[PDB]
Amino acid sequence: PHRYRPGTVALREIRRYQKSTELLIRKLPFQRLVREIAQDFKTDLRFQSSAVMALQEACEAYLVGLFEDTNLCAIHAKRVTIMPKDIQLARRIRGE
Amino acid sequence: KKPHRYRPGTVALREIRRYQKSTELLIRKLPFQRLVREIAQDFKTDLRFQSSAVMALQEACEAYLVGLFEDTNLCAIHAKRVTIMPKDIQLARRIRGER
Amino acid sequence: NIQGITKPAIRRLARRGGVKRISGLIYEETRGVLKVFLENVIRDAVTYTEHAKRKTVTAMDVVYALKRQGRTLYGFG
Amino acid sequence: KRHRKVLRDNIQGITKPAIRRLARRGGVKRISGLIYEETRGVLKVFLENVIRDAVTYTEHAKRKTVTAMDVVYALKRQGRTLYGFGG
Amino acid sequence: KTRSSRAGLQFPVGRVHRLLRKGNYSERVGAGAPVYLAAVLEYLTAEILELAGNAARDNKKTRIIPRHLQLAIRNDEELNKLLGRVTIAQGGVLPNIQAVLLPK
Amino acid sequence: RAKAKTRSSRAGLQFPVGRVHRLLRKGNYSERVGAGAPVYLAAVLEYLTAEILELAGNAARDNKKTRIIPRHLQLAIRNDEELNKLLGRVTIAQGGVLPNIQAVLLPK
Amino acid sequence: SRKESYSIYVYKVLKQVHPDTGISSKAMGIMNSFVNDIFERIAGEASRLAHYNKRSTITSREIQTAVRLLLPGELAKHAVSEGTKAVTKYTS
Amino acid sequence: RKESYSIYVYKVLKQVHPDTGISSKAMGIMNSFVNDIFERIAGEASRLAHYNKRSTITSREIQTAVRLLLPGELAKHAVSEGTKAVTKYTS
């Protein structure tokens, strides 16, 4: 059987997902999470559909930016694998 | 007998303690003023400056640099080094969003 | 419900971020970060809803919340 | 009508020991020789942006003297609010 | 005759004036201020649409879509600076792989 | 005419309600200003002032100083998580920084 | 040349909380900068609140919502408590 | 009802790219953009007026605000367009 080396498919996926723009998290679980979190501030709230889509765009854009910075931090330490300490460094420098 | 000579790093650490305890400005007043006036001259000639304006600018510059060095140090330590290098500064400024 | 943000989804997001190899411990950490972010935004969003004495969070509420945290979003006006 | 000596090479007034002292306040223990030029460049960029904005305010008021308030506003609008120079 | 027509503009000067009057910005509004503002907004709109059209043509599409706007903005240093903290929904990101990740 | 009572006194406050009202009227924030709004605002400003002064006094006594100086204000602000969050982007002139050495730099 | 500041009120509060503590001139200036900063932030946020809801009057309700937006957690709860108590005592 | 800049965006588009269209979402994004820059400029102008104790916002305040917000070449070109427009309008 044929087998691609580790990394080739990863790179293919990088090109694939940087070429397109569709949302990458499933709609319904995301909505469920949003409603659960909202429930802890005020009961019985409802949501307009476009509000949830807006929140999803914001969340995914935020995470993508965080992963770019995380990758730069990983490469700085001459590694290619991102680790939790990389995320924590990135978040400390952003000021969160 | 051999002259007294502390090992590399001792005096650096003592200086860290010393300068974190105090608050006085660390750059000489007059060269800084000349720098400001030179830079200012490339936008409009013959400007004058109030003294307190220059002192304010100096506070801002030194605070900015101090923060940059904190982040630079964290970036250096992340790479398991103890010496800060230019690539550390460039990483810090890239993540802040200035470049 | 935090588990609905699945491992392959986070992998896809990381792919868009250019990440080639990912330690197993990243996923839980990412989830925590996400939760914090969401909380803050939603906390503000519901506040606007409450100020208007409404029970339905609108898209405009979210846009204002995001704007005041310096993360201006285009497309939902 | 007796102007000062034309300003040149003033970036060299930011001496090596001064930058070292600043680094000490930042907790840096060891410093590569190449750090100094980089620091000078960064500082220069920062200064340019601030002074540009300050002078813009000065010109809007049709004044020829940059005031402390001009600087405070310039810094404020760049998200680096400075306390201590009001009034 | 409209003020926009006298000013050679496409953006609605009158509407901008009304929005300034009702935006609680100042007690009075000069006659030239909305003209100037409208001109600036039209110029910037033209710049963004220029670049987005170029990006659309590279992609052999006849309609500008959000993807083209994101590509146009991020590929221009001054626009990218201006919109450094703006998220374009359905914009994606610029194609970009760090050199160290490629083989060899 | 009735004896003059100040609104600050009616509210049990130290901060000047009248002045805050005038600044709201002349700050072009809204066309109209309710009678209760400046009282609330004054109370919040007074409370926050009290909180900062509380921490700064504590710091002053810890340093065996009887007069609060800017150094004490900087120490007070950076050592309190919520104030540090609120003033995350503020520079205190003559404040310095918190004493802090990364553990990896100390000798073994 | 009359320049208003919060100096006398800051001094009264200081005497309430630390009877034997003083303050340098620079620190009082810093306090004035601080007070003006928080004032501007709150008034501006309140203005935006009023604008979003097409109301022409800023009332104590807008102040309260703005306070909840700007201050974190327990600081916000305590400030809200103080404001509410103060307004209710004033109203009577 | 609900105002937008759509028709003006379309006129500009026809000036710069006669054969190019635009999706509904892209037009919405353009409207968000225009409103954003509007708010920024008006707010900066407001602070300018307050700092100088002037009660009138004039074209000069607009110009200074433009110089503060836009970087470099964008600022210069914007100033050029503003000046030409005010000069053509005045006569």
Residue numbers in the entry:
A (entry chain A): 38 to 133
B (entry chain E): 36 to 134
C (entry chain B): 25 to 101
D (entry chain F): 16 to 102
E (entry chain G): 15 to 118
F (entry chain C): 11 to 118
G (entry chain D): 32 to 123
H (entry chain H): 33 to 123
Give the article text.
RAD51 is the central eukaryotic recombinase required for meiotic recombination and mitotic repair of double-strand DNA breaks (DSBs). Here we report the cryo-electron microscopy structures of human RAD51–nucleosome complexes, in which RAD51 forms ring and filament conformations. We found that RAD51 forms multiple conformations in the complex with the nucleosome, such as ring forms with eight (octameric), nine (nonameric) or ten (decameric) protomers, and a filament form. Notably, we found that in all RAD51–nucleosome complexes, the NLDs of RAD51 directly bind to the DNA wrapped in the nucleosome.
The nonameric RAD51 ring form is detected in either the presence of ATP or AMP-PNP or the absence of nucleotide cofactors. The RAD51 ring forms bind to the nucleosomal DNA and incorporate the linker DNA into the central hole of the ring. In the ring forms, the N-terminal lobe domains (NLDs) of RAD51 protomers are aligned on the outside of the RAD51 ring, and directly bind to the nucleosomal DNA. The nucleosomal linker DNA that contains the DSB site is recognized by the L1 and L2 loops—active centres that face the central hole of the RAD51 ring. The spatial arrangements of the RAD51 octameric (or nonameric) and decameric rings relative to the nucleosome are distinct. Accordingly, different RAD51 protomers recognize the DNA end by the L1 loops in the central hole of the ring. In the octameric and nonameric RAD51 rings, the L1 loops of protomers 5 and 6 bind to the DNA end. DNA end binding by RAD51 rings is commonly observed among the octameric, nonameric and decameric rings complexed with the nucleosome. In our cryo-EM analysis, the RAD51 NLDs aligned on the periphery of the RAD51 ring bind to the nucleosomal DNA, anchor the RAD51 ring near the linker DNA and facilitate the targeting of a dsDNA–ssDNA junction by the RAD51 L1 loop. As compared to the RAD51 filament form, the RAD51 ring binds to the nucleosome without drastic structural changes of the nucleosome, such as DNA peeling from the histones.
